[PDB]
Amino acid sequence: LVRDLPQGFSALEPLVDLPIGINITRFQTLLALHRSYLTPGDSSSGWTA
Amino acid sequence: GIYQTSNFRVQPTESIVRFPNITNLCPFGEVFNATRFASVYAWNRKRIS
Ligand SMILES: *[C@@H]1O[C@H](CO)[C@@H](O)[C@H](O)[C@H]1NC(C)=O
Known part of the structure; x- marks a missing residue:
């Protein structure tokens, strides 16, 4: 709609609960690069x- | 006059339950077969909900 994100009406749906047995303190995101044919x-x- | 006595209550004469039939397709056979586990030292947390 006109607003990018402040207005909305829905709910977030759980799928699966999983364990992770290690301490976590930092997070980092990834990205994808498209190869350019020159x-x-x-x-x-x-x-x- | 009117005198109140022990209350009248009918107990249920039946108890029968209808359970799910297929759902999640053999909880223990997809990854552990019937009886097959790993070594002692690998105390992996594997719970199925
Ligand atoms: C799973 O266990 C059964 C008997 O418990 C036996 O057929 C075999 O050990 C396993 N199944 C397969 C297909 O290997």
């Missing part, structure tokens, strides 16, 4: 996000 004369490596 001309041989460029001689460089590039990615598109």
